[PDB]
Please model this.
Amino acid sequence: TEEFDAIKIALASPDMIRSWSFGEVKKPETINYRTFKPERDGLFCARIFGPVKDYECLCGKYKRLKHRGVICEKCGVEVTQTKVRRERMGHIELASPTAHIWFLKSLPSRIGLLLDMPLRDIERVLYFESYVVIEGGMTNLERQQILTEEQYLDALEEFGDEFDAKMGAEAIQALLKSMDLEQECEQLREELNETNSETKRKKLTKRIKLLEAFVQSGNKPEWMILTVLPVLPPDLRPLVPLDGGRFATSDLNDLYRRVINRNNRLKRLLDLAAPDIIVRNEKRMLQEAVDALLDNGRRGRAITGSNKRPLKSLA
Amino acid sequence: PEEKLLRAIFGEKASDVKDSSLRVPNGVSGTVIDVQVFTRDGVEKDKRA
Amino acid sequence: GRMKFNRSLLREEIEGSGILSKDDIIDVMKKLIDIRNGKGEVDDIDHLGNRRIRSVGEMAENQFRVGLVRVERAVKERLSLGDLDTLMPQDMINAKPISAAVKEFFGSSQLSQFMDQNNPLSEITHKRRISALGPGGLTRERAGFEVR
Amino acid sequence: EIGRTTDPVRMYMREMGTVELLTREGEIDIAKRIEDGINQVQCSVAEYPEAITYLLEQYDRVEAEEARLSDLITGFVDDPELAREKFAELRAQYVVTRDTIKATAQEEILKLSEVFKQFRLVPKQFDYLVNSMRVMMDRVRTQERLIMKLCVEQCKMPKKNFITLFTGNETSDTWFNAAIAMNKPWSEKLHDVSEEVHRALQKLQQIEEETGLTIEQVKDINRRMSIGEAKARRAKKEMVEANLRLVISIAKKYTNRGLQFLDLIQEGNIGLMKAVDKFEYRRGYKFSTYATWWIRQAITRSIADQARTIRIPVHMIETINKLNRISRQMLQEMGREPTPEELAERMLMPEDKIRKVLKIAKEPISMETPIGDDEDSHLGDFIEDTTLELPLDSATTESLRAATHDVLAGLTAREAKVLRMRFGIDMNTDYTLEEVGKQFDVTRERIRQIEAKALRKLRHPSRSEVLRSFLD
Amino acid sequence: HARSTGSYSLVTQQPLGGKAQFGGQRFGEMEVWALEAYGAAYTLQEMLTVKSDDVNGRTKMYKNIVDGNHQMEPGMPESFNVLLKEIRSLGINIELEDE
Amino acid sequence: DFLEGEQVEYSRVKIANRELEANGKVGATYSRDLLGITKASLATESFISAASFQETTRVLTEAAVAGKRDELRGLKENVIVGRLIPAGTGYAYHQDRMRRRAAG
Amino acid sequence: FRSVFPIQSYSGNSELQYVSYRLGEPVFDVQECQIRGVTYSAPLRVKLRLVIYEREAPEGTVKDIKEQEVYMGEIPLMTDNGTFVINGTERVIVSQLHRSPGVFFDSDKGKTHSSGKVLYNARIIPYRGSWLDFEFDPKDNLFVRIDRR
Amino acid sequence: MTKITVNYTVDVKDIQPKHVRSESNPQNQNKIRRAWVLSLSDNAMEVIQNKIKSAPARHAYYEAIDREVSNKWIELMRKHTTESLNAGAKFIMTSCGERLEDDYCGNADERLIVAAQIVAETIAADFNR
RNA sequence: AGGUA
Model:
């Protein structure tokens, strides 16, 4: 009943991620323990992902097949078919932009090679080991260079309100914003016709091929840094009752709970103007949690309470 | 709707309790040789126990 | 461990302190250097003299020692958190961790198995079974033809 | 450090290692500079009339018994009597200072700031006054920046010339003519946008009238404010950074009991900041003692919320902890097991609630765990989908729908038609008896009589036999 | 063990479960290769969609067989929709495009 | 790009096109390269097939950053999709679909 | 017990000393344990004494209190058939064959750091604790590895 | 008023390292920034600092300078290729594509520095107003 | 976990 000649894979944009999402997951709450009705607006939510049982609002308002083309406006919960809960995706609005682990620790690091910047440097910048200049000015400081704590402090003291440098995934995303693909492609095309040096021509050819491929892909490099994180439909990460105190829960559920906890804590700290050490620590939290969720195993494993086993990740 | 029509016709209504009796799994047979009843302390005993 | 340590270094001692001493480390270096010189000889990791059997008692004692270690942490926290004067010691010892860990060992473990009980021979073989797997042994990521 | 590290714990320890521990008098000195900053900001709020008018409005509301007494003030630096006396003399000082506006004025302002120096108010009211003065700053800077944008983008003049000429009265026509006097081209260009600039100046003067003070004093007082909270925030951040070690040490005790250590220390840092905001040395206690309970509360909240997969209320968590402690006590006393009868006896809680709580206290398990102690199959590989209708039942439903449609076709036109909308047969909507009657232009007992006639006709053992099989 | 209807799964729709009536037999990649080796196309599609994971196709097949008719809806296996949603759960776009 | 590792079928249709046409650009010359079975399966035209039975994460990342668009026409691709394979009995069907594509 | 006891307090001079242990008779025999689905286990009761020394001065006991037969858990008791009953099911603990604690002077062969000349390495495997490694390199140098770092 | 802006025009040492990046495999850009930085004196430093009072505003201004110098460099290279073709230079096919003959080729660095200097003069003119 | 091919 579905016809399609081909499948495209590309970089998901924050706007189209919101397009997939039917609601923003704002709470790490799951259910009411004794009453297994999902919370609002938690990882399981009828207000977001759709009703649990067939064609009835989860408020006790509408229970019939008649109320299916109209959603319940008397409360947050909507009324549709239950299979919709297997397809609706959500989104989490990350307070700080977070780097995608796949684009980071793959043997060819797409973030690394697009910035033509070695892996250790990205690891140190993202994990808050050192600063990086997100564009300088009329300084003796390059457009891109890593600086340590004391080096960054010395640059700030020596150079005043002209110095734009941040630290972590925000800095990486700023760098990707400041990089333009088509203009660099034109520059490389001009230089190739003029340059005659072998090594220079090889560098120009490699960079022009890479940038032209990225442009043909129709992707914006900033999308490699996740601003909004999609969350899988609850049915694909099921929570099903089981006898006794044991209940089947998804490792994905715990991972998203951790991500939501750390994101909310970051939001609260930012609202409280917390010291730089604490906010850096919480951004480290968010980066680590997102990395484990996307692929747990390339960050020194993540284990849960009451269970000693590497948590299942999407990868 | 068809179920509602049938219950209106036959005069029957939904049962307040659903059957959950333990059936023998299909494919096996035999004699019930022993029956154990465990009711926790503080809960009323039944005749079989 | 001490008896094997002295045996491989060719000492008449068959007993001593469990913790290493500087003399023991130096002797190990000297033996390894002599083997490098060709004077010494290597030892197989498959000789039954180099592989020891932990029966039920030793495994249970080791796990009980782990339980004693965690309850020791609890006791040492309590001795400073709690009263530094007279208080009855039964109120500061916790049976839950030791018993829970012992039950975890006996019930849910790689080496605690339902007795294969369909023959007297099956029971005898299961009780006489020798496993190279388990906690502290060899994972199935082997072959590793040597041990097999 | 730079040691090819990928653990946030390590470099968090690196960060906390930079700051050296404090002594008992060091905490007092830092809290003293904090108190100096908060006194500076209180004086800044003191020089602002409108926040004081708002405070007096809430005091009057409290006197009218419309608001809680403990939601406005907490303690004083030398009770309803003291509050009434201080607010009465404070209103007197406020009015005598305001009369000087609409030498002597400076003395009245000094006495006013002195009579606020006695006040110690709730953090919420203080935060409200801070936000009000902050939005005063925002509106003043917004008017100034609007004048900036107009004069720069509409007259094409650099931002440097504006600062010297405009500053000093900023609310008069003197600078207009002063800039025009040099016959500059931008001065002539300003005559085509003069109306909007003058209207914005009128709004600025209206803001001054609302404040009741000249805008220059507003800038002076708000700059004193800004430096005040700058000093306060710097000192508070110094306290928080120097006290991270206490948080780490406290949390590492709770790490052995489940939950990530990093989350615990982050929550403890939140509680530490909360304690810092609430800390005082007029009490005479050590800061560490006060912060300890705050950190413990934050850690308990974290374990209650972010450690349980399913939500469990904090009071329910405390009940669970009490139940477990009493269970341990009874277990070590009796020496056999915790019997539910004694558990019921110890609590006011019946026992069925005890067992349901015991069921609740256990956390859900992953399906990724192997069933059968490391079988290569996972638990979730066995869970049957109970929300899916069996194809047997779907086929039964289809056959029943076909049979009901055939039977309705076996009846008359109007009877079958009434039955279709009465129960919603073969349309995605259902209609009430009166709704069908309205469309059948007969709203009486007649429609229900038609329905009963259809039922009686169906009672015959010629149309019920086919439907007899479906319901046994 | 033999089944024509019974225990399905939650996350996927692969039929398995139950100590009373188990699931079907795992038609693993080896058997898919075996079918691909012949010109076995429709049988392979039955192995993949109608009887494995396409819930709508499965119901329609059961109704058709009961009614006495032998044809299938190709549909889409629920496993592939799960794969699409899970890939979209990452920062990765995946879509189905028409010609 | 004078060093591009390219599928030979596309190279062959392109050289056939340039030879039949009056346009002899540039060019174009190629040298067949040999890759191990794992590498050949890893560098196929369809990212679904490569990601299925080999390093899934890296293949998916490469496809996403490159914005690949696999057009099926492969046994495992259609197996994953859940339609008739383009082999044997299904070859008649797909050949029909080929006629329905690129033409009314 | 003698390895872990006595337990010394972190400041307070309140030490816990071990005396002996006693096995209580099981509350249920093998038959009723299998019938009821409960473990066949014996209670463990231990004699302990809390001693408080001079506060505060060099060591020396000032006061001592004795807890007799304190229950610190129930240990499964072995049946006469050589098995244990834990949940009504009769379980067996398989004896494990594992590398003995001591020193192994192993030969490193098959991987040579692109140099040949198979090497030798001495591993000190403790009964409990951290492994120790003394290994060679094809440059005739000796290296120490605590665990596998 | 502000009419002081001296451009640090024309230097042989304006082509001495501009390719320097802190990091491996130097590529285009980060030489453009150095190109328009060394084209302005420290007087221009202080003038830019005083004229714009916002860090994001100066940031965007430097981005605009980068954009305009890049555009003028591109157009200068285009006109150089055009005049070379008009001067009798052809397109040599190398394993990188088309290039010009060496006797008709210069280098991209001097084109970039000339473009940066012209843009520097433009910014000075905009700043002496 | 054990066992089967």
User: Anything to note?
Assistant: Residues 3 and 30 of chain F are 9 Å apart (CA to CA).
